[PDB]
Design a protein around this nucleic acid. Structure first.
Lengths: 136, 98, 181, 49, 44
RNA sequence: CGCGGGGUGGAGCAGCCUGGUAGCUCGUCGGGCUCAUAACCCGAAGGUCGUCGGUUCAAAUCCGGCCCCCGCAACCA
RNA sequence: AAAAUG
RNA sequence: UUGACUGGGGCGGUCGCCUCCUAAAAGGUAACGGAGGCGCCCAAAGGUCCCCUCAGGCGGGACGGAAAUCCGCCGGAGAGCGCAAGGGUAGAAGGGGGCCUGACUGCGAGGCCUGCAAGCCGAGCAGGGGCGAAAGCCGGGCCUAGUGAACCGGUGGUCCCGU
RNA sequence: UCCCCCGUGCCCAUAGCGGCGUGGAACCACCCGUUCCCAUUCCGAACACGGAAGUGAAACGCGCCAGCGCCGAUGGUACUGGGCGGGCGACCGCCUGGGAGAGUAGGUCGGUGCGGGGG
């Protein structure tokens, strides 16, 4: 909700930023293919997330739209598009961890995310943890 | 703080860096671009009287001869906090003018 | 008019009790005193031929120096006067001129201040040095009632070479600074 | 301390007892006690006994 | 305003530019003439 | 989709390109006249000026962002 | 030769 | 006679100049691609010499907002730099003061940029000046926009021509 | 030669901030005064002049400290001149040279010419 905007499409090269690590939560949802995820999609996932286990734990959505997706009105050529119209999106490079759950069973957690994946226009993978950290 | 550096505005080589203490005044001829000093004329770190101004002169005469001796003349004055006033080198010899 | 009790006393009376009370070593590590700044704010220089270089010197008498006409640093549409000029008189008494004024303050003015009970021991609050503001301008021996054409006090600051308000507070409690504990 | 700016000195200094009748020096209201004191409710019952 | 300065009692011009309403009128100032060296040069 | 006009006390109109002063009629309120109501008479009140901000010392007033309101065009195949 | 209703 | 561009033309918008981006780490670089300015202003907002250093934050202070003016620490730049943006900048280009008028005349090595013609920088010499004790600085303004070939005339001036 | 200190330049934060003790014989400063020079939109505060009684408390100088700041490898990757495969495509990968940025280990409360005064 700010700054001067209606920006350049730009492209998604290798996913040099497609691969973080569960930061909070317990289990997670990492992306396999690069893409633009419409807020419309995030919610549509998150919602079903919470909704899968009514009155459950916590949901963390690390990805976040901010890129304005413009579009023409159904005509020809003459200056950038009315822009936005539908809205904004976030850019996901294969490997980024989109959503992550916690405070619940793996049977409940794992199965929860699985659904989300159906909402997102990508191919996903689910992860656990115990991996990366900065301890000794 | 005083960022004076009234100097720094010295481009024509040869600097007559002065320095007034609270009893003794020191003057010094320096070559920049090649950091080194040549002529020197302190106040009491020399000897002479005990009167600032009075001294401030006989202390400059010092630089005169001393300098001229090794082929020095045209130069520019100096010292930043200086405040061109009491302390003085109003003396013959050096073509530093003033 | 060169040396005054307050000044005098400070030395042959305050120093000691202080050297002891607290406990120093070097007479310079001591609680010296060196600057008083009676400053006014007035209110304006607005319309109706507002010269107000009147209370200017009115102030001078109460002190000794001539104050410096202060000017605006910014501009505020909220309450008139903007950009430059305007007014905000100020003056700095150092050494002598200072001592005396205080001495005259601490023995005639404050007394007499409207009612008076003491001073605010919280005004230092800790940070070395003090502060305080007087409402009336005619609470001074030099000025008169048939003189002042309009009330308009101000505020005066004072500086201590000491830090801890503790010290600072003692130095003044000794110099005769009254205190509404 | 410069030109016709200043004003003077003379005795407008150590003139200690410069007529405290001016209003009051370290005379009254020494910051001690003055007229009567308190009114006191109940502690002051002169009705009867 | 497109101003120029007429050296009093001769010719020459400096071709200056004042600001009228903005405190002006009576412009004149030591400039160098071609007919020997300086004078003041007025307005006009 | 595009142009251009307009949102100001309760209603209907000014004031805005020429920035600091909100004006008019109607109605609301109080007091008179009258047996009483109208009418008539005297005297008052009442406006975040559509909104989210920008420039300025200062924005009804100037510059952009939408929200309803009104008009004009939207033609050749 | 004259300034509505109840 | 009733312009051109134009993802056909008309309608609409635009047409020169400045600043970011696009622009792919020298320059340069398109599109009816994204986003803002200019068609002026300073007689001090210009010279030079001499001084000063900001904005904020935290306390403390009569009237006093949440910054009126004071005092005290902390604060290297986030202020300032006439107006857009950018670069630059306090070891000043910023704030104040005293004298001034180089917002000169004659010129101009050597370059930048470049199809042309335009635009830009410029040391130095001469003359006669300003400020500074001096070294020195001074041919307008922290810098880039604030502008228009020729032709035709108008006002002056002058060594020239004048059937 | 090696110490101490006053001027100065250079490297341009590994020299910074903040702590902790020390130094006054010299130097330096603060101090002593405002008659003269010259001073502050008001203040000799700052500029300035004349003096040296007192001090090392301020400030500066010199040491020690890692808590903040600054520096900072090696490895390893990202990306990439050049060359080149797979797949329908979205994209994935190899060969040959270059090679960060972050982060780790760790480093640092300086270094260094010139001229002076003192043992």
């Amino acid at each position: 909700r700010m700054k001067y905007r209606k920006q350049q499409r730009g492209r998604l090269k290798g996913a040099t930023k497609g691969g973080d690590y569960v930061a909070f939560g317990d289990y997670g949802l990492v992306a396999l293919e690069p893409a633009w995820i419409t807020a419309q999609q995030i919610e549509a996932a998150r919602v079903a997330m919470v909704r899968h286990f009514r009155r459950g734990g916590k949901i963390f959505i690390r990805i976040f739209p901010d890129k304005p997706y413009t579009k023409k009105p159904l005509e020809v050529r003459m200056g950038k598009g009315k822009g936005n119209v539908e809205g904004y999106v976030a850019v996901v490079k294969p490997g980024r961890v989109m959503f992550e759950v916690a405070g619940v069973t793996e049977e409940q957690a794992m199965e929860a995310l699985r659904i989300a994946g159906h909402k997102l226009p990508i191919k996903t993978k689910i992860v656990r943890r115990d991996a990366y950290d900065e301890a000794q | 703080k005083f960022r004076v550096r009234n100097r720094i505005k010295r481009t024509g080589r040869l600097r007559l860096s002065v320095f007034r203490s609270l009893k003794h005044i020191y003057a010094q001829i320096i070559d920049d671009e090649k950091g080194v000093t040549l002529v020197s004329a302190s106040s009491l770190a020399l000897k002479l009287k005990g009167n600032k101004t009075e001294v401030a002169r006989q202390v400059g005469r010092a630089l005169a001869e001393k300098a001229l001796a090794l082929g020095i003349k045209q130069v520019a004055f100096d010292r930043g906090p200086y405040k061109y006033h009491g302390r003085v080198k109003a003396l013959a010899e050096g073509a530093r003018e003033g | 008019p060169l040396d005054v009790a307050l000044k005098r006393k400070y030395y042959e009376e305050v120093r000691p009790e202080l050297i002891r009370r607290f406990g120093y070593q070097n007479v310079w590590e001591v609680p010296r005193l060196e600057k008083v700044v009676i400053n006014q704010g007035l209110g304006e220089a607005k319309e109706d031929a507002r010269i107000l270089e009147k209370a200017a010197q009115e102030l001078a008498l109460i002190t000794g120096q001539k104050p410096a006409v202060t000017r605006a640093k910014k501009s505020i549409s909220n309450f008139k006067l903007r950009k430059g000029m305007p007014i905000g008189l100020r003056v700095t008494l150092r050494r002598d001129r200072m001592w005396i004024f205080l001495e005259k303050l601490l023995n005639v003015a404050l007394p007499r201040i409207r009612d008076f009970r003491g001073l605010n021991p919280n005004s230092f609050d800790g940070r070395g040095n003090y502060n305080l503001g007087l409402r009336e301008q005619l609470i001074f021996p030099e000025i008169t009632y048939d003189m002042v054409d309009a009330l308009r006090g101000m505020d005066i600051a004072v500086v201590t070479t000491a830090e801890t308000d503790e010290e600072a507070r003692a130095l003044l409690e000794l110099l005769g600074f009254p205190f509404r504990k | 301390m410069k030109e016709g700016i200043h004003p003077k000195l003379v005795p407008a200094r150590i003139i200690c007892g410069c007529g405290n009748v001016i209003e009051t020096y370290s005379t009254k209201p020494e910051i001690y006690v003055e007229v009567c004191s308190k009114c006191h409710p109940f502690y002051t019952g002169q009705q009867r006994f | 305003l497109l101003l120029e300065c007429t050296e009093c009692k001769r010719r020459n011009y400096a071709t200056e530019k004042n600001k009228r309403n903005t405190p002006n009128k009576l412009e004149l100032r030591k400039y160098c003439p071609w007919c020997r060296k300086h004078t003041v040069h007025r307005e006009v």
